């Protein structure tokens, strides 16, 4: 009942926040609106796209007759038949809970989750309840209840399970890629990709390939990065499936900067068709741009921009103002020169950079110990 | 500073000969020297406390000499009993 | 430079434990 | 008087008499703004612009306090320049003013070439002056790793 | 009683400046 | 504890850096890549 | 009466009793500490004074009818407290005046009878034995009288209560000062009464008599002993000069006045803000910004105090002036969050070389920039924008032509490009050199740090400072 719901929230996001994209998102979601008994979560999709349409009262009396049939079913179960715990009562309650997720709002679903969570003495049922909160917590992008149930699963549930938790390993990184935490934690737990069948617990596999390959270049520069993205097997086949991504890695690895210039623009126009690309459109570009410059400025200390006019790409004055914005950013420890056409770098010798690392971590501790020292002593 | 035990006694036993006119200083300086590590400095502090205060009911010297007679070393108990008899 | 860092945290911790034990014996004596 | 510290600490007793009106106070704070931006040309084009008098004794001390800094800025490791550099760094087309720098200071006009004296010394070799004072700094550490005793 | 106290505050001061001295001196030799 | 003063009273992960918003010039990288190529 | 009248009997009786027992036991605890063991450094004099700032200003704000604050003056009108039976006769009266007020009504204030509530409590056989009792019982009506803000024959009742209390302050420091030492209490009472002596004047006039009296109290102080008396009287003499136009009297004040290194982390936050304001205006910037920092990182244990909002406000202004780029997005904390819109918009146009926007930001927010008190940017930010552009070029580039930089800085004059960089090297914006031959502006030498004593100079500032942290922490920890 919660299986075709990661595409719905994409189509709701695709129609809402851009206004130019409104041709096909109204065409198929309106088919998904009249289907699926989607009658609580559509008024934000209905008022912001169209005016009104009369299919509303028909599905309301159907979901009321379905609710009242399920209202009289489980009260007759509890009044005539007497069993507690995990029984015919229990899976009827989660059948009500899976009704309130697919059809109803979240407010009825959350108060039914907490009601049936204390009606559980096993662990797999409690694991499935926290699976239900974490699945709806990603559907409605709640950053509040994920601060609780993730801790409540890892500390009270995830100690008797045996490899029934890789799915929420994938869900936590999905929250980490959407929040900001896409530096080294996202690419670490995306290294193990052994799951091919897609289910309630797993997303689309093709988009999971694109997500695990866009992040595996920011955590590690080249400490044998070629072993884990090229010498792999299960990731190498699925990037062999896609022409652009296989072009994108080879352009970065064999340093074809002229077509890595093009392959980054094709990915970034594709980035708009996503449901979690918000801290990506302005941060993944400038990080990958400054990563391409950094490995290019390696192995050259007297580099000229007359060689940049054909090797990296084209143009002359664009690269000059591009490098000037990043040297003045604080990054890219190299100098630029105009009237001699020599981009002379001044990279440190693993001492003067290490000398900075003591003086930045030192005084940061020193301001901490004085501020400690003055709160005490009255 | 010195290392012979006899001269350390005769140094700290000389407190009573110089401060007997004011009894308000002899418990102030013996009470921290009567808890030293060697028995000799604890010994000579005990006799200095008795010869400083001759015949005054102090209740502070008697407080100081009370653990002095409870010591495993034999001769430092001896100096406690004489100083208790003097006070 | 570690001796500057470490020994300052040593005597600061000994200051905290005394100022806790001072005010708590003080507030409970009366 | 070359009092930049006293210039700004006086400017508190006038609430809104600096921008709206009062050109008598607006003219120095426009002038001081010109010295901070770096436009020497804007200083002297406004030198012939005074509200009431000619400000004669004030601009001449202002003429004095700039040129010695300009002379102080050009007396560097520079060896020689032609007359056209003193046409730009300094000013007017051969007055008695360049005689004044020639009679007081150097800048001797020879074959259309000035000659400003310049040299430099050399000192990376002295480990000896950080030998004595470093030995003082190391002992005053170890003096203070003990002695509250 | 304004002069008899004034010398007594000096003798309590001078004894205490001695009593802070040798205990501070003893701590050096007690480390040995 | 008043000090004789007056009070007046990702985007939300409590993140940013020094720039992060300073560039807004054309900022889409489809055009800036494309304009660069055609001027060659 | 049916709705709020039922909620009228519960508020008096229990807070009337539990607050009175606290100040009487501490007032009795102040008595035994004044009578014996005058070493009251960690005693309850501080925490009770920490109560009187916090609790009595946020709990009660009016004179508290049904005889809670209004009833303390007929309670304390009959006090002698001299002899041991005479105290126990008054200790009989302490129970009796609470029992009648706790059962029934005794004596009511109608906002006019302050003169029978201040002379006869000072009169009727009062003594000089319990001086903080007379000090607190005179300072406790000072809070609700101002907080009422009714202004109907109230200023002269404030004015009489100040001059009476200031006469009581002279009689303590001069007559029978033997082992009393109420300076830890009388300083903040002198601070809080002068705040009211300023603000009530500030409703109507200036203040000059408050400072000529303040020079006299500092003159008759500063000779005895400096234990936060000279500290709090210094800032009151300095806050007023900073409140008015003159800076010279504050400049000569901050020049020669040594310090007792003891102000209990309450005046150190305040003073390091004031002298940072002073060193800002006489153009001593590097020493200013570090002691502006030192007050801000001193006590962050405040919730929307306004002071932490204000020392943070000036700190980003001065770090723009050094070109040291105050943190471009870190200063949005949940504390202030609203006093940044005139400043986050400010540092945006300061960073770029844009002026038409920078004139738009300045003209739109100019009313804010005058009200807060930092309108000394009008002369100091046109210098900053023209030096920011030459600093960014000299940081990025290494060898630029004068014609190339003159067109880059939209100046359209290759004849004063030599003049800008000459002022940049003279002011110390960048270390460079101009070859006056064809336009060579070269950068520095190859950067070597670890081979020319530079790590020793940074570390020697660290060793001697952190052992001083150790030596201060050793001489604070031991007590009996």
Tokens of A28: 């198929």
Other CB atoms within a 10 A radius of the CB of residue A1 amount to: 15
Exposed, middle or buried by CB within 10 Å (0-12, 13-18, 19+), for B27?
middle
| d(C-alpha A39, C-alpha A41), whole Å | 6
Exposed, middle or buried by CB within 10 Å (0-12, 13-18, 19+), for A218?
middle
Helix (H, G, I), strand (E, B) or coil at A336: strand
Residues of A in contact with C16 (CB under 8 A): 376
| d(C-alpha G268, C-alpha G252), whole Å | 20
Determine phi and psi for A295, rounding to 5 degrees: -75, -25
Four-CA torsion G27, G28, G32, G34, nearest 10 degrees: 20
Q: Which of F9, A37, D14 is nearest to G304 (CA)?
A: F9
G77 min Cα distance to partner chain F (Å): 32
- Integer angstrom CA distances of residue G450 from C1, G396, G430: 16, 23, 21
Contact criterion met (CB below 8 Å) for G253 and G237:
yes
Contact criterion met (CB below 8 Å) for A293 and A323:
yes
Determine phi and psi for G441, rounding to 5 degrees: -120, 100
Contact criterion met (CB below 8 Å) for A330 and G395:
no
Q: Which of G331, G308, G305 is nearest to G320 (CA)?
A: G331
Determine phi and psi for G433, rounding to 5 degrees: -155, 145
| d(C-alpha B67, C-alpha B83), whole Å | 13
Residues of C in contact with A369 (CB under 8 A): 8-9, 12
**C-alpha atoms less than 13 angstroms from C-alpha of B78 in its C-beta half-sphere:** 6
| d(C-alpha G405, C-alpha G424), whole Å | 14
Contact criterion met (CB below 8 Å) for A61 and A73:
no
| d(C-alpha A202, C-alpha A186), whole Å | 17
Nearest CA in chain G to F22: G348
Exposed, middle or buried by CB within 10 Å (0-12, 13-18, 19+), for E29?
exposed
| d(C-alpha A277, C-alpha A312), whole Å | 27
Q: Which of C17, E20, C5 is nearest to G459 (CA)?
A: C5
Measure the CA angle with vertex C23, ends C19 and C28; round to 5°: 150
| d(C-alpha G189, C-alpha G136), whole Å | 9
Contact criterion met (CB below 8 Å) for D118 and D78:
yes
E interface toward D at CB cutoff 8 Å?
24-25, 27-28, 31
| d(C-alpha G474, C-alpha G478), whole Å | 8
Contact criterion met (CB below 8 Å) for G416 and D41:
yes
Nearest CA in chain D to G282: D5
- Give the C:G interface size as CB pairs under 8 Å: 39
In angstroms and rounded to an integer, the radius of gyration of the C-alpha atoms of chain C is 13
Contacts with E, B 29-48, CB within 8 Å: 29, 32, 37
- Name A367's Cβ contacts closer than 8 Å, sequence gap at least 6: G297
Query: Which residue is listed with tokens 């770096």?
Result: D38
Tokens of A334: 């190299």
DSSP letter at A334 equals B
| d(C-alpha G334, C-alpha G362), whole Å | 26
CA D7 to chain centre: 16
DSSP state string for F12-28: SSS---SSSSS--SS-S
**C-alpha atoms less than 13 angstroms from C-alpha of A362 in its C-beta half-sphere:** 18
Tokens of G266: 């309450």
Secondary-structure breakdown of chain C: helix, strand, coil percentages, each rounded to the nearest 5: 95, 0, 5
| d(C-alpha A230, C-alpha G10), whole Å | 78
Contact criterion met (CB below 8 Å) for G257 and G222:
no
Contact criterion met (CB below 8 Å) for A343 and A303:
yes
Instruction: Convert A97-108 into a string of H (helix), E (strand) and C (coil).
Output: HHHHHHCCCHHH
- Integer angstrom CA distances of residue G432 from A357, G268, G342, G427, G445: 27, 41, 35, 12, 9
Measure the CA angle with vertex G199, ends G193 and G202; round to 5°: 145
- Integer angstrom CA distances of residue B45 from B27, B32, B38, F20, G194: 10, 9, 12, 76, 59
Contact criterion met (CB below 8 Å) for G377 and G349:
no
Nearest to A367 among G297, G458, G462 (CB): G297
DSSP letter at A345 equals B
DSSP letter at D52 equals S
Nearest CA in chain E to B38: E30
Helix (H, G, I), strand (E, B) or coil at C27: helix
Q: Which of A220, A142, A131 is nearest to A170 (CA)?
A: A131
Other CB atoms within a 10 A radius of the CB of residue G93 amount to: 15
Determine phi and psi for G397, rounding to 5 degrees: -75, 170
Q: Do G477 and C11 touch (CB under 8 A)?
A: yes
Instruction: Convert chain G into a string of H (helix), E (strand) and C (coil).
Output: CCCCCCCCCCCCHHHHHHHHHHHHHHHHHHHHHHHCCCCCCCCHHHHHHHHHHHHHHHCCCCCCCCCCCCCHHHHCCCCCCCCHHHHHHHHHHHHHHHHHHHHCCCCCCCCCCCCCCCCCCCCCCCCCCCHHHHHHHHHCCHHHHHHHCCCCCCHHHHHHHHHHHHHHHHHHHHCCCCCCCCHHHHHHHHHHHHHHHHHHHHHHCCCCHHHHHHHHHHHHCCCCCCCCHHHHHHHHHHHHHHHCCCCHHHHHHHHCCCCCCCCCCCCHHHHHHHHHHHHHHCCCHHHHHHHHHHHHCCCCCCCCCCHHHHHHHHHHHHHHHCCCCCCCCCCCCCCCCCCCHHHHHHHHHHHCCCCHHHHHHHHHCHHHHHHCCCCCCCCCCHHHHHHHHHHHHHHHECEEEHHHHHHHCCCCCCCCHHHHHHHHHHHCCCCCEEECCCCEEECCCCCCCCCCCHHHHHHHHHHHHHHHHHHHHHHHHCCC
Nearest CA in chain G to A321: G396
Interface test with D, best of G283, G288, G384 (most D CBs within 10 A): G283
- Name D77's Cβ contacts closer than 8 Å, sequence gap at least 6: D118, D119, D120
Determine phi and psi for A343, rounding to 5 degrees: -85, 85
Q: Which of B21, B9, B20 is nearest to B46 (CA)?
A: B9
| d(C-alpha A81, C-alpha A74), whole Å | 10
- Name A216's Cβ contacts closer than 8 Å, sequence gap at least 6: A187, A190, A191, A225, A228, A229
| d(C-alpha A108, C-alpha A101), whole Å | 8
Contact criterion met (CB below 8 Å) for B62 and B28:
no
Contacts 24+ apart (CB under 8 A), G364-373: G368/G342, G369/G342, G372/G313
Nearest to G462 among C1, C14, C30 (CB): C1
- Integer angstrom CA distances of residue G19 from C27, G8, G61: 19, 19, 15
Determine phi and psi for A289, rounding to 5 degrees: -70, -45
| d(C-alpha A172, C-alpha A187), whole Å | 12
Contact criterion met (CB below 8 Å) for G242 and G251:
no
Q: Which of A280, A289, A278 is nearest to A325 (CA)?
A: A289
F38 min Cα distance to partner chain G (Å): 25
Do B and C touch (≥3 CB pairs < 8 Å)?
A: no
G407 interfaces chain A, CB cutoff of 8 Å: no
Q: Residues G250, G254, G256, G257: is their CA dihedral positive or negative?
A: positive
A97 min Cα distance to partner chain C (Å): 53
Q: Do G420 and D38 touch (CB under 8 A)?
A: yes
- Name G431's Cβ contacts closer than 8 Å, sequence gap at least 6: G425, G444
| d(C-alpha B33, C-alpha B16), whole Å | 14
- Name B67's Cβ contacts closer than 8 Å, sequence gap at least 6: none
Determine phi and psi for E17, rounding to 5 degrees: -70, -25
Task: Encode burial over A11-34: b for 16+ CB neighbours within 10 A, e otherwise.
Answer: bbbbbeeeeeeeeebeeebbebbe
Nearest to D41 among G281, G416, G460 (CB): G416
| d(C-alpha B7, C-alpha B9), whole Å | 5
Nearest CA in chain C to G456: C1
Query: Which residue is listed with tokens 């004789």?
Result: F4
Tokens of G451: 């081979």
Q: Where are the alpha helices (DSSP H) in chain A?
A: 6-16, 25-34, 43-47, 56-80, 88-102, 106-117, 124-139, 146-156, 166-179, 185-189, 205-214, 225-229, 234-241, 243-253, 257-271, 284-297, 317-327, 352-375
Exposed, middle or buried by CB within 10 Å (0-12, 13-18, 19+), for A281?
middle
Exposed, middle or buried by CB within 10 Å (0-12, 13-18, 19+), for F18?
middle
Overall resolution, Å: 3.5
Other CB atoms within a 10 A radius of the CB of residue A264 amount to: 19
DSSP letter at A343 equals E
Exposed, middle or buried by CB within 10 Å (0-12, 13-18, 19+), for G264?
middle
G371 interfaces chain D, CB cutoff of 8 Å: no
Task: Encode burial over G22-59: b for 16+ CB neighbours within 10 A, e otherwise.
Answer: ebeebbebbbebbeeeeeeeebbbeebbeebeeebeee
Tokens of F6: 């007056």
Tokens of A67: 């609710």
- Any chains having at least 3 CB pairs less than 8 A from chain F are A, G
Contact criterion met (CB below 8 Å) for G470 and C8:
yes
Nearest CA in chain G to F11: G329
Contact criterion met (CB below 8 Å) for G201 and G66:
no
Helix (H, G, I), strand (E, B) or coil at A302: strand
- Any chains having at least 3 CB pairs less than 8 A from chain A are C, F, G
Contact criterion met (CB below 8 Å) for G170 and G186:
no
Helix (H, G, I), strand (E, B) or coil at A344: strand
Q: Which of A45, A33, A38 is nearest to A62 (CA)?
A: A38
- Name G452's Cβ contacts closer than 8 Å, sequence gap at least 6: D124
Contact criterion met (CB below 8 Å) for B23 and B58:
yes
C5 interfaces chain A, CB cutoff of 8 Å: yes
- Integer angstrom CA distances of residue A201 from A93, A151, A197: 21, 19, 10
C12 interfaces chain G, CB cutoff of 8 Å: yes
| d(C-alpha A10, C-alpha A8), whole Å | 5
- Name G474's Cβ contacts closer than 8 Å, sequence gap at least 6: C11, D148
C30 min Cα distance to partner chain A (Å): 21
Measure the CA angle with vertex G125, ends G119 and G131; round to 5°: 75
| d(C-alpha G54, C-alpha G437), whole Å | 70
Q: Which of A122, A190, A181 is nearest to A157 (CA)?
A: A122
| d(C-alpha D30, C-alpha D47), whole Å | 12
CA G192 to chain centre: 12
Tokens of A112: 């039914």
- Name G254's Cβ contacts closer than 8 Å, sequence gap at least 6: G238, G275, G278
DSSP letter at A303 equals E
Contact criterion met (CB below 8 Å) for G45 and G33:
yes
- Any chains having at least 3 CB pairs less than 8 A from chain D are E, G
Other CB atoms within a 10 A radius of the CB of residue G89 amount to: 12
DSSP letter at D114 equals -
| d(C-alpha G470, C-alpha G465), whole Å | 9
């Amino acid at each position: 009942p919660k299986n075709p719901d990661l595409r719905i929230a994409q189509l709701r996001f695709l129609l809402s926040l851009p206004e130019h994209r409104g041709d096909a998102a109204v065409r198929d979601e309106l088919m998904a609106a009249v289907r699926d008994n989607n009658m609580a979560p559509y008024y934000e999709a209905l008022c912001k796209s169209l005016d009104w349409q009369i299919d509303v009262d028909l599905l309301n009396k159907m979901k009321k007759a379905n609710e009242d049939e399920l209202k009289r079913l489980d009260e007759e179960l509890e009044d005539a038949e007497k069993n507690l715990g995990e029984s015919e009562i229990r899976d009827a309650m989660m059948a009500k809970a899976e009704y309130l997720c697919r059809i109803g709002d979240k407010e009825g679903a959350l108060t039914a989750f907490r009601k049936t969570y204390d009606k559980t003495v096993a662990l797999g049922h409690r694991l499935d309840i926290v699976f239900y909160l974490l699945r709806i917590g990603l559907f409605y992008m709640d950053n509040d209840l994920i601060t609780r149930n993730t801790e409540k699963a890892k500390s009270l549930i995830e100690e008797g399970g045996d490899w029934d938790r890789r799915n929420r390993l994938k869900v936590y990184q999905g929250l980490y890629c959407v929040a900001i935490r896409d530096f080294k934690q996202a690419a670490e737990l995306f290294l193990d990709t052994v799951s091919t069948f897609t289910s309630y617990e797993l997303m689309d596999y093709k988009t999971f390939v694109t997500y695990t390959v866009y992040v595996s270049m920011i955590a590690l520069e080249r400490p044998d990065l070629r072993e884990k993205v090229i010498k792999g097997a299960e990731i190498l086949e699925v990037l062999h499936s896609l022409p652009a991504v296989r072009q994108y890695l080879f352009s970065l690895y064999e340093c074809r900067y002229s077509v890595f210039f093009q392959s980054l623009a094709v990915v970034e126009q594709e980035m708009k068709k996503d449901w979690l690309f918000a801290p990506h459109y302005r941060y993944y570009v400038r990080e990958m741009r400054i990563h391409a410059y950094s490995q290019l400025l390696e192995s050259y200390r007297s580099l000229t921009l007359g060689y940049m006019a054909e090797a990296f790409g084209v143009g002359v004055e664009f690269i000059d103002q591009e490098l000037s914005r990043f040297i003045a950013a604080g990054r890219l420890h190299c100098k630029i020169d105009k009237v001699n056409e020599i981009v002379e770098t001044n990279r440190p010798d693993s001492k003067n950079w290490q000398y900075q690392e003591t003086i930045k971590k030192g005084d940061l501790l020193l301001n901490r110990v004085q501020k400690l020292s003055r709160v005490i002593n009255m | 500073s010195d290392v012979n035990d006899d001269v350390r006694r005769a140094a700290v036993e000389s407190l009573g000969f110089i401060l007997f006119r004011t009894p308000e200083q002899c418990p102030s300086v013996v009470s921290l020297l009567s808890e030293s590590y060697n028995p000799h400095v604890r010994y000579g502090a005990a006799m200095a406390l008795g010869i400083c205060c001759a015949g005054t009911g102090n209740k502070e010297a008697i407080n100081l000499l009370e653990p002095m007679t409870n010591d495993p070393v034999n001769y430092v108990r001896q100096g406690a009993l004489i100083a208790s008899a003097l006070i | 430079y570690l001796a500057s860092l470490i020994r300052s945290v040593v005597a600061l911790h000994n200051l905290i434990n005394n100022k806790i034990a001072n005010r708590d014996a003080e507030k409970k004596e009366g | 008087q070359n009092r930049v510290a006293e210039f700004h600490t006086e400017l508190e007793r006038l609430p809104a008499k600096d921008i709206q009106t009062n050109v008598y106070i607006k003219h120095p704070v426009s002038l001081e703004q010109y010295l901070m931006e770096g436009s020497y040309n804007k200083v002297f084009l406004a030198k012939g612009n005074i509200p009431a008098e000619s400000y004669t004794f004030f601009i001449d001390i202002l003429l004095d306090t700039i040129r010695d800094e300009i002379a102080g800025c050009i007396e560097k490791a520079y060896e020689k320049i032609l007359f056209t550099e003193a046409t730009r760094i300094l000013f007017f087309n051969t007055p008695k003013k360049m005689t004044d720098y020639a009679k007081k200071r150097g800048w001797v006009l020879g074959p259309n070439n000035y000659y400003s004296f310049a040299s430099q010394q050399q000192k990376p070799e002295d480990t000896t002056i950080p030998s004595t004072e470093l030995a003082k700094q190391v002992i005053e550490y170890a003096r203070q790793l003990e002695m509250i005793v | 009683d304004l002069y008899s106290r004034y010398k007594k505050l000096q003798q309590e001061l001078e004894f205490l400046e001695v009593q802070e001295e040798y205990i501070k001196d003893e701590q050096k030799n007690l480390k040995k | 504890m008043s000090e004789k003063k007056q009070p007046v009273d990702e985007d939300n992960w409590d993140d940013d850096n020094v720039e992060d918003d300073f560039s807004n010039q054309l900022r889409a990288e489809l055009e800036k890549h494309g304009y660069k190529m055609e001027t060659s | 009466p049916p709705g709020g009248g039922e909620q009228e009997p519960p508020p008096p009786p229990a807070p009337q009793d539990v607050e009175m027992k606290e100040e009487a036991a501490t007032g009795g605890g102040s008595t035994g500490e004044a009578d014996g063991k005058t070493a009251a450094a960690a005693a309850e004099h501080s925490q009770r004074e920490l109560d009187t700032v916090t609790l009595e200003d946020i709990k009660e704000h009016v004179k508290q009818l049904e005889k809670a604050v209004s009833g303390k003056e007929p309670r304390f009108v009959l006090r002698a407290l001299r002899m041991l039976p005479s105290t126990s006769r008054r200790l009989n009266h302490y129970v009796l005046y609470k029992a009648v007020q706790g059962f029934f009504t005794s004596n009511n204030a109608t906002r006019d009878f302050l003169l029978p509530f201040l002379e006869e409590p000072m009169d009727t056989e009062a003594d000089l034995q319990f001086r903080p009792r007379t000090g607190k019982a005179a300072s406790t009506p000072l809070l609700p009288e101002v907080e009422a803000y009714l202004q109907l024959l109230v200023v002269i009742f404030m004015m009489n209560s100040k001059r009476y209390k200031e006469a009581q302050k002279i009689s303590d420091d001069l007559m029978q000062k033997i082992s009393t030492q109420n300076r830890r209490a009388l300083d903040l009472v002198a601070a809080k009464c002068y705040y009211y002596h300023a603000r009530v004047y500030e409703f109507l006039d200036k203040l000059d008599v408050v400072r000529s009296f303040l020079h006299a109290r500092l003159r008759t102080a500063t000779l005895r002993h400096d234990a936060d008396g000279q500290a709090t009287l210094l800032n009151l003499l300095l806050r007023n000069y900073l409140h008015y136009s003159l800076y010279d009297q504050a400049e000569k004040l901050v020049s020669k006045s040594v310090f007792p290194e003891q102000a209990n982390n309450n005046e150190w936050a305040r003073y390091l803000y004031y002298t940072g304001r002073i060193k800002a205006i006489q153009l001593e910037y590097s020493e200013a910004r570090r002691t502006m920092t030192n007050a801000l990182r001193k006590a962050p244990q405040h919730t929307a105090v306004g002071f932490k909002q204000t020392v943070h406000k000036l700190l980003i202004v001065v770090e723009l002036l050094l070109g040291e780029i105050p943190d471009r997005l870190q200063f949005r904390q949940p504390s202030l969050k609203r006093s940044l819109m005139p400043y986050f918009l400010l540092t945006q146009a300061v960073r770029t070389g844009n002026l038409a926007k920078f004139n738009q930001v300045l003209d739109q927010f100019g009313e804010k920039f005058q009200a807060d008190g930092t309108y000394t940017l009008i002369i100091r930010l046109r210098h900053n924008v023209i030096k920011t552009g030459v600093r960014m070029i000299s940081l990025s580039y290494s060898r630029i032509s004068l014609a190339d930089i003159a067109q880059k800085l939209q100046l359209d004059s290759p004849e004063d490009a030599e003049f800008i960089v000459a002022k940049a090297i003279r002011d110390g914006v960048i270390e460079a050199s101009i070859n006056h031959e064809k336009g060579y502006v070269q950068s520095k030498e190859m950067i070597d740090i670890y081979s020319t004593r530079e790590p020793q100079l940074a570390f020697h500032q660290r060793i001697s400072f952190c052992l001083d942290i150790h030596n201060m922490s050793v001489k604070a920890m031991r007590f009996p």
